[PDB]
């Protein structure tokens, strides 16, 4: 099964700064990667789908990029509401798998 | 309206139905098989089309028995449909060449 | 019962025989060649079918001379068979268009 | 000059136009999609040709929806064109066999 | 001996010639291009055959302009040849159905 | 030829516990991996075929998983009768090859 590596595990950044979490697939998955946000005690929330396509209702602040095995989820200008855990998930090959998660910390 | 042209038409509506069903059945059959890639509707549809036209680039293909079974049906439908059109074009040319000569 | 329809039928029984034999011969020819993947009956059958229909996804193919020789026969049989059906569909359309006009 | 032969000719000029347009549209649709390889005119042309002839080696293929849509059109045009020629060859053989017998 | 059957025969001798020449020309055109794999006669022959039958598994394909040009010719020859046979099978069925009815 | 790496060589576990042996193929072999058991002085016995398909007569205790290059043979709740050597074998490419073996030890 495809392995999604998310490192660093924790990301520290100053308010307003730009930030990026990385997700590496154990094999080439095209752009079949998706990003989810999960705040303390909430359920996951789809941020970016298919590596770069944006979802409606998601701050224009969130962008995605990458293809193959290296994917990036960026937040231009971080802010308190962004403090959560971020996961990546691939649908290239069965079964869908999840990343270990990266905690954003301001 | 002439038979060959009715068949051609039918063949097309049919092919489309098979492509759609083929897409659905493929995903249904392939999910659950580790490493399978024919697992989302959109690409599956692209898969069946490229299979029906017999092009098959290899970017997508079934790996399970039912998926392959679905593939065969799609291949055969695409081949028969397109061949049935060729056959209709022949009946058309043949029928009209008889005219350009009289009968 | 009309010739074109007999041929079509024959062509199909034949194709099936070739697919089966093709599958067997392929594995027989490919085993013994390092790196070969066309080495188990089930997939070989899937291979020959996708070869006979000329789709050939590339997930499986012979690498030995006899395997490829077996591939050519399968390709040709599939092509001839399906073409023979198209030909039967034409004789059918042509024969009936003559009716829709009298003769 | 006989219809079947006019059609064949048209089919060819047409196919060529589709190949060229297909090449252009493909690059236009594919650029902007990360990882896409169908992004330069020369190879795109090689791509469409191998797609129109239904060969499709898999060295190149669209990954975007519009690219695939362009692929389908090219596949269908190639298939119809070549099938239309076969149909013309039949009308030719059929028309002349009637001669070798009288009519 | 009937035209359609002469053509079919010619088409076959021809296809074979094209396959052989195709194999030679391919290697000639591909050698000198870094990374090219279509560079030895035996496999090139296997390549052209799988190209003429339009199967094209993707294990081998030209990467140079002349190699691809040689590929197109082979694709077209294979397609025309096999289509010309289908056409011959039709003239045969059509001519004999006229018999099973009198004329 | 395909190389099947089985590490660790020896696995120590407490009775009833869950255990997993890994098998890594030098290249992607789909699910064409199979598992065999061989107790002291016996002949191999097929446990799992095609990475995850179960064989009849084999305790429901044995399961398989994996695809591509990483395969796992798990035993939910180990017990004395499980003390043996476990091998993996691939049929993806000729010639079939075997893993070096992992000894289960309670
Ligand atoms: K291919
Ligand atoms: K084809
Ligand atoms: K093909
Ligand atoms: K192909
Ligand atoms: K391929
Ligand atoms: K490939
Ligand atoms: K055809």
DSSP letters spanning F32-59: -EEEEEE-TT---EEEEETTTEEPTTS-
The answer to whether C72 and C25 have CB atoms below 8 angstroms apart is: no
- E58 to D59: CB separation less than 8 angstroms, yes or no: yes
Distances (CA, A) of E46 to C46, D42, F99: 20, 26, 35
Which H or E run contains B14?
helix B3-30
Residue A6 contacts residue A21 (beta carbons within 8 Å): yes
Name the DSSP letter for residue E22: H
Structural domain boundaries enclosing F80:
1-106
What angle do helix axes E65-97 and D65-97 make, rounded to 10 degrees? Answer: 40
Could you tell me the resolution of this structure in angstroms?
Answer: 2.7
Bridge partners of A89? A34, A98
Mark the residues whose beta carbon lies below 5 A from ion ligand 5: B 58; C 58; D 58; E 58
Output the 3-class SS for C23-84: HHHHHHHHCCCCCCCCCCHHHHHHHHHHHHCCCCCCCCCCCCHHHHHHHHHHHHHHHHHHHH
Fold of D1-103: Helix Hairpins (1.10.287)
User: How open is the CA angle E53-B83-B8, to the nearest 5 degrees?
Assistant: 160
Contact of B20 with D21, CB cutoff 8 Å: no
Q: How far apart are CA E97 and CA C33, in angstroms?
A: 50
In terms of Cβ atoms closer than 10 Å to its own Cβ (0-12, 13-18, 19+), residue B73 is: middle
Could you tell me the CA-to-CA distances from F99 to F3, F25, F56 in Å, in that order? Answer: 7, 9, 23
CA distance B80 to chain A (A): 32
The domain total for chain F is: 1
- What distance in Å separates the CA atoms of residue D17 and residue B70, rounded to the nearest whole number? 34
Closest CA to E85 of F70, D92, D90: D90
* Those residues with Cβ within 8 angstroms of residue B34's Cβ, 6 or more apart along the chain or in another chain: A1, A93, A94, A95, F31, F51, F52, F65, F66, F67
- Give the integer Cα–Cα distance in Å for D70 and D62: 9
CB A15 within 8 A of CB A72: no
Helix (H) or strand (E) holding A62: strand A62-67
Cα(first)–Cα(last) distance of chain C, in Å? Answer: 20
Q: Which residues contact D46 (CB under 8 A, 6 or more apart)?
A: D60, E68
End-to-end CA distance of chain B: 20
Q: Cα–Cα distance between C82 and C15 in angstroms, integer?
A: 9
CA separation for the pair C53, C41 (Å, rounded): 18
- CATH code of the domain containing A51: 2.60.40.10
- F20 in contact with chain C, both atoms CB, cutoff 8 A: no
| Chain B residues interacting with chain C (CB cutoff of 8 angstroms) | 2-4, 7, 51, 54-58, 61, 63, 65, 68, 71-72, 75-76, 79-80, 83-84, 86-88, 90-91, 94-95
Beta strands A53-54 and F70-75, pairing class? unpaired
Dig out the tokens for B64 from the structure: 């399970």
What phi and psi values does residue F26 have, to the nearest 5 degrees? -65, -10
d(CA B58, CA E56): 10
Supply φ then ψ for residue D102, to 5 degrees: 130, -80
Q: Report the C-alpha gap between D103 and D92 in whole angstroms.
A: 14
Query: Three-state SS across chain D?
Result: CCHHHHHHHHHHHHHHHHHHHHHHHHHHHHCCCCCCCCCCHHHHHHHHHHHHCCCCCCCCCCCCHHHHHHHHHHHHHHHHHHHHHHHHHHHHHHHHHCHHHCC
């Amino acid at each position: 099964d495809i392995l999604l590596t998310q490192s660093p595990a924790i990301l520290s950044v100053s308010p307003g700064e730009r930030v990026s979490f990385s997700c590496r697939a154990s094999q080439s998955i095209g752009t079949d990667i998706h990003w989810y946000q999960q705040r303390t005690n909430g359920s996951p929330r789809l941020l970016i789908k298919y590596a770069s396509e944006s979802i409606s209702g998601i701050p224009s602040r969130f962008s995605g990029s990458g293809s193959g095995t290296d994917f990036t989820l960026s937040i231009n200008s971080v802010e308190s509401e962004d403090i959560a855990n971020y996961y990546c998930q691939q649908s290239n090959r069965w079964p869908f798998t999840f990343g270990s998660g990266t905690k954003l910390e301001i | 309206s002439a038979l060959h042209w009715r068949a051609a038409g039918a063949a097309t509506v049919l092919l489309v139905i098979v492509l759609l069903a083929g897409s659905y059945l493929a995903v249904l059959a392939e999910r659950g098989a580790p490493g399978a890639q024919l697992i989302t509707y959109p690409r599956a549809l692209w898969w069946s089309v490229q299979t029906a036209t017999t092009v098959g680039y290899g970017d997508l293909y079934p790996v399970t028995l039912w998926g392959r079974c679905v593939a065969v049906v799609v291949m055969v439908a695409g081949i028969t449909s397109f061949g049935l059109v060729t056959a209709a074009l022949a009946t058309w040319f043949v029928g009209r060449e008889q005219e350009r000569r009289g009968h």
